[PDB]
Amino acid sequence: GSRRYDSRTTIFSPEGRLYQVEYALESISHAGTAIGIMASDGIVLAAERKVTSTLLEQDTSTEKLYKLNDKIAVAVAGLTADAEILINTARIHAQNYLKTYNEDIPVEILVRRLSDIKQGYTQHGGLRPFGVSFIYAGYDDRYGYQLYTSNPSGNYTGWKAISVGANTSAAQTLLQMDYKDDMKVDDAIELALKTLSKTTDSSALTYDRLEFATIRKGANDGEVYQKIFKPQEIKDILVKTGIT
Amino acid sequence: MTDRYSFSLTTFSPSGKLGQIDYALTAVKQGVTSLGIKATNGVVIATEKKSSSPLAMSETLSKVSLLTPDIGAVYSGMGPDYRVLVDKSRKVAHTSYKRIYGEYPPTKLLVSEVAKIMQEATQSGGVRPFGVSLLIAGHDEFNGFSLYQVDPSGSYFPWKATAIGKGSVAAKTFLEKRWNDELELEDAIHIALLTLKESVEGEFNGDTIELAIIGDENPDLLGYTGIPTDKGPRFRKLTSQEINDRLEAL
Amino acid sequence: DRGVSTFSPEGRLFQVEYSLEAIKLGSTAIGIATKEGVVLGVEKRATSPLLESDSIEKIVEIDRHIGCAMSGLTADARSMIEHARTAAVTHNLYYDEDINVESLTQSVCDLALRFGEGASGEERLMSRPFGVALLIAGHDADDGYQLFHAEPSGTFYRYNAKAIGSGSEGAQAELLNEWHSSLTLKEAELLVLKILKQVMEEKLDENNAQLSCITKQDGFKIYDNEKTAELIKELKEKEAAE
Amino acid sequence: AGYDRHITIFSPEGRLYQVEYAFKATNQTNINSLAVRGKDCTVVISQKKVPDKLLDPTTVSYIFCISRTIGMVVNGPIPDARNAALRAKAEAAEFRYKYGYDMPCDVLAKRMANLSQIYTQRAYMRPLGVILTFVSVDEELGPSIYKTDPAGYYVGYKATATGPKQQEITTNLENHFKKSKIDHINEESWEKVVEFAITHMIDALGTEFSKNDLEVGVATKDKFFTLSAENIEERLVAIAEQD
Amino acid sequence: GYDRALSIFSPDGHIFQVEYALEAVKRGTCAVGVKGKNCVVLGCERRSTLKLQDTRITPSKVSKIDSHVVLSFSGLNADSRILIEKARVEAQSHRLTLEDPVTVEYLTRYVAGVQQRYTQSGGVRPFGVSTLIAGFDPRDDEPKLYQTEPSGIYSSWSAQTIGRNSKTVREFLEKNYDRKEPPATVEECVKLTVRSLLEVVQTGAKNIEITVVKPDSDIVALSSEEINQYVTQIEQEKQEQ
Amino acid sequence: MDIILGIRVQDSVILASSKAVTRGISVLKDSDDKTRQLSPHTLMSFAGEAGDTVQFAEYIQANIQLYSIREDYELSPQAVSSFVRQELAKSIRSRRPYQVNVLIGGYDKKKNKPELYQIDYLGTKVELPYGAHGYSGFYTFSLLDHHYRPDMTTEEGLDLLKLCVQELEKRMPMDFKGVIVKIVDKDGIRQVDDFQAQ
Amino acid sequence: FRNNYDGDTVTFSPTGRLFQVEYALEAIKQGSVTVGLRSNTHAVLVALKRNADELSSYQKKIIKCDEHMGLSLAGLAPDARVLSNYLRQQCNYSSLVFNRKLAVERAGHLLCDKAQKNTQSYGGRPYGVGLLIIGYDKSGAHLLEFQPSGNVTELYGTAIGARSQGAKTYLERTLDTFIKIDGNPDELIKAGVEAISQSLRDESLTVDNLSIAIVGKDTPFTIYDGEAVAKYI
Amino acid sequence: QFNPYGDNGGTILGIAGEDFAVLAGDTRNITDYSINSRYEPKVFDCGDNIVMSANGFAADGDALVKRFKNSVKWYHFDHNDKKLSINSAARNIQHLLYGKRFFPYYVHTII
Amino acid sequence: GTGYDLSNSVFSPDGRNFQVEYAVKAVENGTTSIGIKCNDGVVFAVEKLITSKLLVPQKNVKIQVVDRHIGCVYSGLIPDGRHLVNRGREEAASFKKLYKTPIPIPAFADRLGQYVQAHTLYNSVRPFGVSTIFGGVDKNGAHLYMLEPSGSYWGYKGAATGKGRQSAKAELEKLVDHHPEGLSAREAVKQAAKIIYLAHEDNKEKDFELEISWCSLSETNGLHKFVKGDLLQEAIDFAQKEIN
Ligand SMILES: [Mg+2]
Ligand SMILES: [Mg+2]
Ligand SMILES: [Mg+2]
Ligand SMILES: [Mg+2]
């Protein structure tokens, strides 16, 4: 019957590893790099659109930076289509929570729930893992600005700065080297772009090749704010940081 | 009996490749060239009606399909996969949207729905992925004119213009040369026809070519009048004759 | 990679024969049945000096007149006991009487061959056989004191004495010589403690071996350390004697 | 493992071998068939071959009545053909009940083709090794030929032919329609269009037929029927007094 | 729908998936647990491949199951969450239907039960997790410490470690743990714990974490400086002879 | 019905709950505590149909206890009642609804403000200075309308309650066997054990 | 060949054989012998019971299905439990619903149909047991031989299990004698112990070893073990 | 409106002696004012020396008698031909009966 | 690279389904069985290999009746054909319940046809190891059919299958030439006994038992009945006399 054709996606290797998760993680390594850096007064998300044309509509596009609710956003590396499946259910879990508690979902709870879905595909059902890694950038009034990563395995961790996708080794050492805890947000913007400049496989790093977003807080307001950068604004911020 | 295949038939190979998605894209590569170009006041989708016999009637098989009165589709790849993707796309436009909000979905959202339908053939138990790439052209009040590509992976991106299938690499080069953000609709039709001549071997006229636009409303395809806020569909598939007019003065 | 309930050309089930292998690797367990009670003895076999050797439960109560010993993959036994205890308690509820030992055993063994899909049978949800054999000892009014050997093969045998586990083939040949129909309870308690001492790798103290019995009068009792301690003391003396 | 050749998944070159092999099975009967459109009718001709003398020749047919109006001929093994015929009759009945008007030829074809496309994608189903030619005089489209295959493909034909010698007949008709310049046969009575088909089947294949070598189905306004040997015998007599 | 039998016997009588599960634990970061006379202390090591970490938010290894019982683990972090969540749920359910919080052995028997089932149910793979469960039965002062492994097996321990280089730390403990007289202080029990990790960590200034459980739901975790004071007084003492 | 009263003063929330358990013709107990502590700083009282009353209260209790352990965090009172309201709103359209009216009194640690929530069995929630369920309201509300000041102390609030309980012991046809009073403030939950003779 | 076509019962060999079924039939041969024979008034089952150690029980091989019908097993004992349990139900169903004792011929048809279902579906396995079914219904004495393949045959006498070929030849020779033992139970059993003796390299058939069951005319199905079979050894 | 229950009259008596027992009943089955049968026994032998009557609604009576008789049969099959003692039988019946607690067997029953 | 014959629903490169072809083998290996359609009824005969004196004569019945008017005989795996007739009985009752009229033989044939074909559609089942000869008298004539493991069935003047299949078809073809007139109910019973006797030449080393059944508008009222006693012995003798 069927047994012949089963890849058995949820089995251990003799080394105690999960083939599918590892090859999924291998897949992600080829995907464009995403970086998140958390400062005292906000968070930065930067990502590299992998492969472009001059005919690609830059404005009406989204492939790496997605909004989950008003306080939580994600950087994506891997299969875009898989990510949207997970992103939608995440957007929903955030809303179920609001309906139940009349408060916005705390970032960790969102991250755990999503990662628990991922761990599922790892352990039963015999389907392939989601070929997706996530940087989560969020704010809640318990832990302030938070940064999280999750991958196909179902594991999430918290960070001061992190990167997913291609060249994370190169990127992770560069961040570890220039990151100071009491960074202001405009320092963190600058560092994120530098690191991406230094890891790219392209000629250089133009605006059409970037997605960029910040979670801030207009100092004379007392409430959080998400800003996804329009293609023009990324070109502005590329000039000031000194890579024209 | 019963689908005893409840496990994925698309898995990750050691190198990180998804085998079945790669091979699906290969089938698209052999498909007859289709293309789409976006103007400032309209969009155009075109393809070649490659006839498998001169005994077949090529009208009885549309490669260009209306999805909503404001959204059209075209493809490269396996016809049959496209046909059932068109029926599902039409249906989801009602079930997931029209029956909820009393209006048709905007272009991105419907696209996104098709993308979801394909993504699932890439993960669900006991299926291969869809062997087509879709070009979807639409208009909606709040986003204006748009053109989207959907790959067997379930991945979609917006385009100013692009082509898929056979001579797509040549055509994408051809299109980069001729595109600008000041194009009127008539001009993009003209460019579309030219780009498609490169890929067309045999006869090239309004019988061997299928071409559709997303223009302004045709108050005359509506079928009724009296409701002044219904001007009718923006999708119009051009006639065998209408195509030839633009060729006799090509 | 064939099915799970494939037959070998010899005419035996693959997964059921391999489970029997898993059992041989298990702790030694010995049961001896007299006309004064049934005795159950196990090897604890702590994998380290740091392990608290009495948190090892290889002898369990099923009812006040039925207890069992296990050998093999011992986590697999948890659900077999749960079902057994339930079968007994249930049977009491329906009938205001103690369940027969042969009936309790039959009930446990029914569970054992249920490893399928529901296709061409009924419903058989469970992926692999149990990795554990059981010695089921008890009393009832119809057949008095009884000792049963329960396998993952579905079959179960009645025994006057039986040993399962790593020492199983050597310990058995020993029981063959010692066992006679007139054995007293104390004589059986010593015999269990003797044969365990032999096949165990370790030096048998009241910590890496456990004793129990079921008599009609006092039911099924586990022997605590002090009482087991004094029965080893007595074996040393009686073996040095001749 | 070369298992990409056993179920309906993609080969590295992007093909589905099981689909391709299912086409092979269609020719396994070694029956040739063709379809042509009259002025207001549609006719299908099939080779009737009865190899065994022990067979009841009246039960040996590859032409099926789907509805009052739809007829279907099958190139391919009989068990898959009857499997396909039954679905079609069930699909056609239910269309009428739900929608209150006779299932149109082309729509039935689209449905059957949609069922085929499914066996192409869902792994547990094998394709049906048959090619299905549908005929009727549609109340809206006029006389109609619509054909589907294991690929999930379907199109409308001016005329078509199928079987091991698909090509001889196809080219024969390809020629005729160029000299005649019209995309049908300009003839009022169906009896004459039935003859025309039998004639170009002889001339393409290069063989003569007796009333027991052919099988004929005719579609008219509101009815589809098959000819008996005697109704064909009349046809074979008619052709032979002129050519 | 999917029920393929993944955990099966091989001819040598072995269930390869459960043994490979153990291999995953073997590569998990080391966890240790030792018990005193009036406390149980749980230690874990932290990895230092990447350490630009936000330790405020990152999941810690020692998890509360009820207010009187904790659970640390070694192996796949994702799988651990599926046990911790189930065990927390079962703790509340027990309080609800029995009107008393779980005994430490019960909470353990329950987790083990779950782990076992995943080794003989179709379509599911075993948990690549081993656990140490520590705490005090309600209204009791006699300390408890248990260990479970993927096979569904469990038992109590005077002290035990699991994960990578656990042979080394168990070795240390088999030498340095006296059952005649266990650690009598909170302090002298925490010291014995830090010592055993130092055989594996190599500077645990911020790569060692410690949690102290006491009778009556009295559980607190130490911070770097508090642990730093132990690392300091251990290596200075070990220096001279 | 049972008496369920609540008053939000300034530093805290005060909950009074009748002690009687009447089944049919007999009073079966005169020392009944119609309350559950949901978390260290959140208290719920309840009155209604026989079995439902406790079974629901205990259920909600376990669910908040689970949430606290999962998040090592105590939800705000505002969030607890929102959860409770949803449970009841779900319950009303089920095959057999929980017939339970509750009061939720809590001290919010973020805002440092006490809060009193009244929810009936239908899922009708409102935040109030003072609330009551059943007939209690008809007597006590008017008396509290008069004597309530938002800046009352725990002491003054207890005086104001003593006045409500007296009015009910006077005009209520039923002997509800006195009350059990509990205070919810920044230092947790305590019980004023001396309300029989105070 | 062989190797490739024996992974499950859903597969035919190129010869046209079902290897999983034939390996099931091999469990029978590997199993302890049992014999069946009928006259016109009675039907007997005789069985050699097999033990593991010399300290173990002799595992029982005869099961009662109803008051007028029973069977003997050779092969996988848990499977004979599954099938007799099913057969009990069918006997029971007939009494309750139609107030009719189930025809022995029909019990065969029922078992066949149940066994057959296992030989055509994926993830199933054939029954690994042979069965001999005796009964006295409304048309006299009956003996059935059941194979895991689904083949149920009505015979006068037969044997299955290890070395059963010796007993089978004996009965083929004694046919005309035993068919006429009408009205004497004791003599028909004597001829059933004599028949089972042609299948012994082992040893003397003792008190704990032997198992005999009888049904017919004026006797409900009953089983004998112990001193019950003393007068027959 | 269909009423699932009827009444067939009859009366039964059971007296436990010091080493014996009797269970008696009339042979009369009746509907309303008509007689149905003058001989219709409703006291039954169930083997294992247990006699039983389920008097009241005759359809539910036969159903219970039949179900318990079958319990006896299946007790032998499941427990190596053990005798079902009177106390055991009683408990068994309590379960047969309470099993239909929400659509009762309309019978006063005596064994 | 091959392996085309391991799963049931797989097409080989030349278009064949090998499992069905292997099924046929088990049929050809089986006992021989035949059917003869006369001018008002149908005759069904089968060979019964007596392995031993122990088999009870007259007892092990192979021919099955479906409804009251249909007879079935099959060669090959006996338990399969039993199962197929079980499905045939369900199908016949269901049809009668809805339509009142007892099921027509063509109607009935397709019911088996559709069900048998449906066992060549998925790898999760195997094909039927039987060829089935069946028929009876309906509202317009007698009908004779034969059904292959493939699902294929046709109407026959005469049909044969099993070990003696080739010699039978030869005898059958003779009859079709001598009597293009008809051939009565009473004659075909004798002629079937002959054709079974001649086809026993192949299974010659083992002794056999003949079994005949018929369904005739004039001789059985259009109902299926077994040939017994005097008429059976008269046809056995006709076969013996004409074997020399
Ligand atoms: Mg043929
Ligand atoms: Mg398929
Ligand atoms: Mg398949
Ligand atoms: Mg009793």
User: Integer distance in angstroms from the first to the last C-alpha of chain H?
Assistant: 35
Return the ligand number nearest the Cα of I9: 3
Write the CB contacts of D55 (distance below 8 Å, at least 6 apart in sequence).
I154, I155, I156, I157
From chain G, pick out residues whose CB is under 8 angstroms from the CB of I127. 12
Tell me which chain C residues have a C-beta less than 8 angstroms from the C-beta of E158: 50-52
Å between C66 CA and nearest CA of chain G: 19
Strand partners, F115: F106
Domain that holds residue B117: 1-250
Cα–chain center distance at E51: 22
Kindly name the residue from I2, I31, I120, I132 that is annotated as catalytic. Answer: I31
Locate the domains of chain F by residue range.
1-198
Q: What does R_g of chain I's alpha carbons equal in angstroms?
A: 18
Do G205 and G212 meet the contact criterion of CB atoms below 8 Å apart?
A: no
CA B127 to chain E, closest CA, distance in angstroms equals: 14
CATH code, B108 = 3.60.20.10
Q: Chains with ≥3 Cβ pairs under 8 A against E?
A: A, B, C, F
Distance CA C112, CA C135 (A): 14
Can you give the CATH number for the domain in which I3 is found?
A: 3.60.20.10
Task: Identify the experimental approach.
Answer: X-ray
* C-beta atoms of F78 and A103 within 8 A: yes
Whether A159 and E54 lie within 8 Å, measured CB to CB: yes
Output the CA–CA distances (angstroms, integers) from residue I44 to I36, I104, I141, in the order listed: 7, 18, 17
Rounded to 5 degrees, φ, ψ at D197 are: -70, -50
> Which residues of chain D lie closer than 8 angstroms to B126, CB-CB?
122-124
Q: Chains D vs F: touching, with 3+ CB pairs under 8 Å?
A: no
CATH superfamily of F1-198: Aminohydrolase, N-terminal nucleophile (Ntn) domain (3.60.20.10)
Residues 6+ apart with CB under 8 A from F135: F1, F172
Q: Place domain C1-242 in its CATH homologous superfamily.
A: Aminohydrolase, N-terminal nucleophile (Ntn) domain (3.60.20.10)
Residues 6+ apart with CB under 8 A from G139: G103, G105
Dihedral class, residue I141 (left if φ above 0, else alpha if ψ from -120 to 50, else beta): left
To which CATH superfamily is domain G1-233 assigned? Aminohydrolase, N-terminal nucleophile (Ntn) domain (3.60.20.10)
The first and second tokens of residue C190, run together, are 């010593």
Copy the structure tokens of residue E127.
């948990």
* E100 touches F: beta carbon within 8 Å: no
Domains parsed from chain A with CATH numbers: 1-244 (3.60.20.10)
Q: How far apart are CA C63 and CA C88, in angstroms?
A: 7
Residues sharing a CB contact under 8 Å with residue F69, sequence separation 6 or more, in sequence order: E64, E65, E66, E67, E88, E91, E92
Q: Cα(first)–Cα(last) distance of chain F, in Å?
A: 26
Amino acid of residue C117: E
CATH of the domain at E131: 3.60.20.10
Q: State the smallest CA–CA distance between residue D232 and chain B in angstroms.
A: 26
Q: Do D6 and I12 touch (CB under 8 A)?
A: no
B61 close contact with D: CB closer than 8 A: yes
Handedness of CA B113, B118, B123, B126 (dihedral sign): positive
E strand or H helix at A126, and its extent?
none
Nearest to F79 among A103, A141, A142 (CB): A103
**Contact status of B126 with chain E (Cβ, < 8 Å):** no
- CB neighbour burial string for F77-111, b if at least 16 within 10 angstroms, e if fewer: bbbbbbbbbbbbeebeeeeebbbbbbbbbbbbeee
* Residue among D50, F100, G194, C76 at smallest CA distance from E7: C76
Task: Quote the CA–CA distance of D181 and D196 in Å, as a whole number.
Answer: 16
Residue with tokens 């317009």: I140
- Residue E88's closest chain F neighbor by CA? F66
Cα dihedral value I83, I89, I94, I95, nearest 10: 120
Binding-site residues on chain C for chain G (CB distance < 8 A): 2-3, 5-13, 109-110, 112-113, 116-117, 119-121, 149, 153-155, 157-162, 172, 175-176, 179
Interchain pair A116, E26: CB under 8 A: no
**Single-letter code of the amino acid located at E74:** S
Q: Do A1 and I124 touch (CB under 8 A)?
A: yes
Judged by its nearest atom, the ligand closest to the C-alpha of residue H75 is 4
User: In chain E, which residues have their Cβ closer than 8 Å to the Cβ of B123?
Assistant: none
Cβ within 8 Å of A, E 10-39: 16-17, 20-27
Which residues does chain A have within 8 Å of residue I124's beta carbon, measured at their own beta carbons?
A: 1-2
Pair type for strands A225-228 and I158-161: unpaired
Calpha distance C141→C98 (Å, rounded): 9
Question: Buried b / exposed e across F184-197, counting CB within 10 Å, b at 16+?
Answer: bbeeebeebeebee
For the packed helices F154-171 and F136-147, what is the interaxial angle rounded to 10 degrees?
140
Enclosing H/E stretch for I233: helix I229-241
3-state secondary structure of C202: coil
Asked if the C-beta of E4 comes within 8 angstroms of chain B's C-beta atoms, the answer is yes
Cα(D132) to centroid(ligand 1), Å = 23
Taking contacts as CB-CB distances below 8 angstroms, the residues of chain C near H82 are 100, 142
- Residue B2 tokens read as 């019963």
- Find which of B8, B116, B178, B191 to mutate to test the A interface (most A CBs within 10 Å of its CB): B8
Looking at CA atoms only, how far is residue A38 from chain F in angstroms? Answer: 23
CA dist., res. B4 & res. F34, Å (int): 55
- DSSP class of B12: B
Q: Look up residue B97 and give its DSSP letter.
A: I
Rounded distance from Cα F134 to ligand 4 centre (Å): 56
Smallest CA–CA distance from G21 into chain C, residue? C7
Structural domain count of chain E:
1
Question: Which one of A100, A141, A142 has the shortest CB-CB distance to F86?
Answer: A100
Cα D126 to ligand 3 centroid, rounded to whole Å: 6
State the amino acid at position F130 in one-letter form.
Y
Q: Are I208 and I163 in contact (CB under 8 A)?
A: no
For residue I153, the distance in angstroms to the closest alpha carbon of chain B comes to 23
- For chain H, say whether C230 makes contact (Cβ under 8 Å): no
From CA I148, how far away is CA I17, in angstroms rounded?
13
**Residue partners of B201: CB distance under 8 A and separation at least 6:** none
Across the beta sheet with D223-226, the strand order is D159-162, D33-37, D42-47, D214-220, D223-226
D86 in contact with chain A, both atoms CB, cutoff 8 A: no
Tokens of B15: 């190198």
**Considering only CA atoms, which of B97, B115, B139, B119 is closest in space to residue B234?**
B139
**Within 13 Å of residue G130, how many CA atoms lie on the same side as its CB?**
28
Rounded Cα distance, A148 and A146, in Å: 7
Dist. CA D10 → ligand 2 center (Å): 11
In chain B, the number of structural domains is 1
| One-letter amino acid of A218 | G
Give the list of residues 6+ apart from residue B52 with CB closer than 8 angstroms, or none: D155
Distance I189 CA to ligand 1 centre (A): 23
Among the bound ligands, the one closest to the CA of H82: 4
**Interface residues of chain E, partner chain C, Cβ below 8 Å:** 3, 5-15, 105, 112-113, 115-117, 119-122, 146, 151-153, 155-160, 170, 173-174, 177
Tokens representing B169? 């690499």
Count of other CB atoms within 10 angstroms of residue H58: 23
- The CATH code that applies to domain D1-243 is 3.60.20.10
Q: CA separation (Å) from C42 to A132, B229, C147, C238, E197? A: 51, 88, 15, 21, 35
How far is Cα D129 from Cα I124, in angstroms, rounded to an integer? 19
Q: Confirm whether I31 is a catalytic residue.
A: yes
- Whether C121 and G55 lie within 8 Å, measured CB to CB: no
Residue B1 CA to ligand 3 centre (angstroms) = 10
Q: Is the dihedral of CA G26, G29, G34, G36 positive or negative?
A: positive
Gap from CA of C156 to ligand 4 centroid (Å): 24
Domain holding E77, by residue range, is 1-241
> Which residue stretches of I142-181 are H helix?
165-178
Residues of A with CB under 8 A from a CB of I: 1-2, 4
- Cα separation, A91 vs A70, whole angstroms: 10
Q: How many CB atoms lie within 10 A of CB D104?
A: 21
Question: Which H or E run includes C88?
Answer: helix C77-95
The domain spans of chain D are: 1-243
Strand order in the sheet with C59-63: C59-63, C66-72, C132-140, C144-150, C156-158
Residues, beta carbon < 5 Å, ion ligand 4: C 97; H 85, 88
Name the residue among I176, I215, I174, I168 with its Cα closest to residue I192. Answer: I168
- One-letter amino acid at I110 equals D
Instruction: Report in angstroms the alpha-carbon separations of F196 from F153, F162, F166, F189.
Output: 21, 10, 12, 20
| CB contact A109 to F (< 8 Å) | yes
Structural contact between residues B24 and B10, judged by C-beta atoms closer than 8 angstroms: no
Cross-chain Cβ contact H77/G96 below 8 Å: no
Q: Which residues, 6+ apart, have CB-to-CB distance to G14 below 8 Å?
A: G1, G5, I5, I18, I22, I25
C-alpha to C-alpha distance for F47 and F101, rounded to whole angstroms: 5
E122/C126 Cα distance (integer angstroms) = 6
To one decimal, the resolution in angstroms is 3.1
Alpha helices in chain E (DSSP H): 16-26, 77-98, 104-117, 166-176, 186-197, 224-239
Q: What is the Cα Rg of chain H in Å?
A: 15
**Which H helix or E strand runs over F144?**
helix F136-147
From the CA of D123, the nearest ligand is: 2
